[PDB]
Design an enzyme around this catalytic site. Structure first.
Site, mmCIF file in Angstrom:
data_model
loop_
_atom_site.group_PDB
_atom_site.id
_atom_site.type_symbol
_atom_site.label_atom_id
_atom_site.label_comp_id
_atom_site.label_asym_id
_atom_site.label_seq_id
_atom_site.Cartn_x
_atom_site.Cartn_y
_atom_site.Cartn_z
ATOM 1 N N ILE B 155 0.863 -1.133 0.000
ATOM 2 C CA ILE B 155 0.000 0.000 0.000
ATOM 3 C C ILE B 155 0.929 1.220 0.000
ATOM 4 C CG2 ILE B 155 -2.039 1.116 1.004
ATOM 5 C CD1 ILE B 155 -2.199 -2.118 0.613
ATOM 6 N N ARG B 174 10.783 -0.528 0.533
ATOM 7 C CA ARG B 174 9.598 -1.280 0.148
ATOM 8 C C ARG B 174 9.871 -2.179 -1.043
ATOM 9 N NH1 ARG B 174 7.492 -0.298 4.986
ATOM 10 N NH2 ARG B 174 6.192 1.576 5.050
ATOM 11 N N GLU B 218 2.680 -11.793 -0.754
ATOM 12 C CA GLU B 218 1.642 -11.449 0.192
ATOM 13 C C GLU B 218 0.320 -12.169 -0.181
ATOM 14 O OE1 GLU B 218 4.436 -9.134 -0.194
ATOM 15 O OE2 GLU B 218 4.107 -7.569 1.230
ATOM 16 N N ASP B 267 -0.081 13.134 7.278
ATOM 17 C CA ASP B 267 0.205 11.714 7.443
ATOM 18 C C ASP B 267 -0.063 11.231 8.864
ATOM 19 O OD1 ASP B 267 2.424 12.217 8.961
ATOM 20 O OD2 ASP B 267 3.852 11.437 7.484
#
Ligand code: 4LU
Ligand code: 4LU
Ligand code: MN
Ligand code: MN
Ligand code: NA
Ligand code: NA
Lengths: 465, 469
Positions: B155, B174, B218, B267
């Site tokens: 995400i 990531r 995942e 955020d």
């Protein structure tokens, strides 16, 4: 003139009083029921059928802040700030209106006929020493002035006509007694206790007015009319004419008894300690008398809720001194006085530290407050989601924490290293300004006030809950 | 096989989904409504009538820990502890559990491509007033690297910058960003295929956010949570696979060298982060269901839906901590502490000084808690998850100066501006346990315990008492 019965009718009409007809024991069971009720924000409770007694028991009277506001004649809890500005000004006030007769002296019993066992005095927690009177307004005079102090001091049952008088040494009653002993050696100290007075008188007793002033005078200001009283039968002290029950007697100089253990507002038992004995020579009451009672324990309890409503009274007083203060809150979870959260409009580097020192020094109610958290005005002091957010995003723990040692601490706080002495911690969770930090500080997310307002407007129509 | 629509019907039957028919703007207003809802522990929300769009907006899906559990098929959140023990063992052959590839899927019922692609038709939310632009927040970004078959799902937030352009804001550690970085070295100047799925089934979504190894897909973990293989479909314009039950899919590529200034955006810390450059994702295709629903969220001052997710997924580590420190009864990182900055730990205390060993364990044993700056330690009579218990313990069992541990010059997150120096700061531990002889010379307090017979009697007559009604 609203007495207590008028207040109970008002509550009942609004779904704020519930009558219990089931048999319920003043020993332990009432506390359990009231505790569940209060923790779910339910009504005040009138137990019409206490196991083994004929007098109904009223409790959880002030278990919501709303009901505290109602008991001062106001609609809601925000009105309490106005009574705070009033309290600022007293730092002519109205005397009492003495009636010639009163309902609280309809049935009288004295001397050998006095039996406190006829009253449904509650036992609160399983290891409490004995039944305990918890909502008595204790009335005293000192020898040096006319002023009548009213206080709430817990009273252990130790005989047919003996209570222990558990006043801590800085209370009005205990000072009056202490002075009486010095000024009139060996003479009995007259004392009277009123149970179930009108709510203005009860809340006046518990509001910290000056020692110079009678709590009866303040209640008159909250009410709008003079407090109606009646002379006691056996002394010159005056008690509220509308009282449900009155105890009259004296403290014999030197006579003391071991008190407790009793469960306390901290959620622990106080260990045994000696206090003066109050000998009861008379018990006066209404026809149909109602016994008003409560309990303290792990917070929140009725005292804690009283304490949150009365903190609203102090905000204005603090703001007069420290206009930078936007909000000031002592959560019930912190045993009502041990932690405070303060929000400010910060105006200069170091500002939070001045504010901490003000909380610790300005008023005596907060002299013993051991944690102080200071935040900016974008934090709602009453929401741990905001306060923890501020702590975790605006502090470096070692830079921004103030510790001070060897400060006054409540003698019953067992967590301090020595009785009466301990440290305090202040957390500066304000945004750090140049000088306080050499980093680029973060720009916090502010909501659009027009979006918020629009959502307030359509919120009920949205019907999410 | 439960897709997302089945999950929503389940939630609606249980009073956990609320449909809003009032007009509501995706610009700012949805966030405000969802924020109030989440903070009051209310339902998931389906805005059936978003001002200026025809596609309904689903948000606050996982705003409650219960709903995270329901999304994994379970009653309660503890099932995640079993995943804790499983993840311990890999440092189980039929956890080599592939995807089941369908030919044809509802997510490709309506297809639009090239010049017809208009992301402005989608009700992408603007979360906070000074955010740069609308932002896609619940996209499962799918990538392959050039060196292995494994498909990573992440995400990563995506800023709208054109009819067919998004910014791809993946931080450099990531899976997506590593895959891209390798592609550039291994195939200089060639476009990097990427696809983003919106509104997959809940096990897939929850799997995307679980920290599994980079070695593993995942998609395989979601299969373990579900009990059945994850159903996928090949993308139209590349060889990547996306969930068959997706409501919307975006397909395209990253043109090597093409970047854009991203943000500012609010955020999860509750601050705006400042502008920075990230790769641009060019969208060549948009596929979707008939009746497509747009799944979205927001991040801001905690607690928000990410924070609540984070709390349910931390349950994974409790077992691992308990193996090392069996005295630990519970271990909780509240959302309101930005998910990692404060921990509350409860223990069965066994000796003077015990709380300090535990603090040092939180700060040293696992890397996820290396950067945790506040630790509060309590006894096992405290519910770590209720500030009414924790504040009670703090205020009745501590002397602040005796019982507070400060240590300086410790590792701190470089982006935590509250520390004196980037990457370096202090930590505080609060020992709120009962003090034993040695730790105090006073007689400690005996807490008030209720009579269980009294409690039981009151349970029995409680309905008959009828205090509410
Ligand atoms: C409302 C309330 C207040 C109690 C109280 C209780 C209640 C219900 C009990 C009965 C449930 C248990 C603890 N009580 C005591 C007490 N103060 C004190 O010195 N001894 C006490 O035992 N307090 C506080 C005291 O009554 C208030 O501080 C008064 O404002 C003191 O008035 P003064 O300053 O004029 O003495
Ligand atoms: C649930 C969730 C997780 C976000 C996230 C969001 C949500 C809703 C947003 C979209 C609302 C806003 C903040 N997001 C970002 C993010 N990680 C990241 O590098 N950039 C992000 O912008 N995270 C975390 C990230 O997706 C997880 O750590 C994944 O497990 C990463 O997978 P990986 O380790 O395989 O790359
Ligand atoms: Mn007084
Ligand atoms: Mn991955
Ligand atoms: Na008083
Ligand atoms: Na992941």
């Amino acid at each position: 003139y609203n007495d207590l019965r008028d207040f109970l009718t008002l509550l009942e009409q609004q779904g704020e009083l519930k009558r219990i007809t089931l048999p319920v024991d003043p020993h332990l069971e009432i506390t359990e029921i009231a505790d569940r009720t209060l923790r779910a924000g339910g009504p005040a409770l009138l137990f019409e059928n206490p196991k083994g007694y004929s007098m109904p028991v009223l409790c959880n009277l002030f278990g919501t802040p709303k009901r505290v506001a109602m008991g001062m004649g106001q609609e809601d809890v925000s009105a309490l700030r106005e009574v705070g500005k009033l309290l600022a000004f007293l730092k002519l006030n109205m005397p009492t209106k003495r009636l010639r007769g009163a309902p609280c002296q309809q049935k009288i019993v004295s001397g050998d006929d006095v039996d406190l066992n006829r009253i449904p005095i509650m036992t609160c927690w399983p290891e409490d020493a004995a039944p305990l009177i918890t909502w008595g307004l204790t009335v005293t005079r000192g020898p040096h002035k006319e002023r009548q102090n009213l206080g709430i001091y817990r009273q252990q049952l130790i005989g047919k006509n003996k209570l222990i008088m558990r006043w801590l040494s800085h209370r009005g009653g205990a000072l009056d007694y202490q002075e009486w002993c010095a000024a009139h050696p060996g003479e009995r100290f007259p004392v009277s206790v009123a149970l179930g007075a009108d709510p203005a008188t009860i809340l006046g007793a518990v509001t910290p007015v000056p020692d110079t002033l009678s709590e009866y005078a303040f209640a008159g200001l909250l009410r709008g009319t003079k407090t109606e009283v009646v002379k006691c039968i056996s002394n010159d002290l005056e008690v509220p004419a509308s009282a449900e029950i009155v105890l009259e007697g004296y403290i014999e100089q030197g006579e003391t008894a071991p008190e407790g253990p009793y469960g306390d507002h901290t959620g622990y038992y106080n260990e045994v300690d000696s206090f003066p004995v109050f000998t009861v020579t008379h018990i006066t009451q209404r026809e149909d008398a109602i016994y008003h009672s409560t309990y303290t324990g792990r917070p929140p309890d009725e005292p804690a809720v009283l304490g949150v409503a009365l903190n609203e009274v102090f905000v204005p007083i603090l703001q007069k001194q420290f206009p930078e203060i936007v909000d000031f809150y002592l959560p019930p979870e912190g045993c009502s006085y041990r932690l405070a959260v303060v929000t400010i409009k910060k105006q200069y580097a170091g500002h939070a530290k001045r504010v901490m020192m003000g909380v610790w020094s300005f008023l005596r109610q907060f002299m013993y407050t051991k944690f102080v958290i200071v935040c900016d005005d974008d934090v709602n002091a009453r929401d741990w989601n905001d306060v923890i957010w501020a702590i975790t995003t605006r502090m470096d723990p070692a830079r921004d924490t103030v510790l001070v040692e060897n400060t006054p601490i409540d003698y019953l706080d067992f967590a301090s290293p020595v009785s009466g002495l301990g440290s305090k911690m202040g957390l500066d969770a304000t945004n750090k300004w140049p000088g306080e930090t050499q980093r680029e500080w973060g720009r916090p997310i502010k909501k659009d006030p027009d979006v918020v307002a629009h959502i307030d407007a359509i919120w009920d129509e949205l019907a999410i809950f």
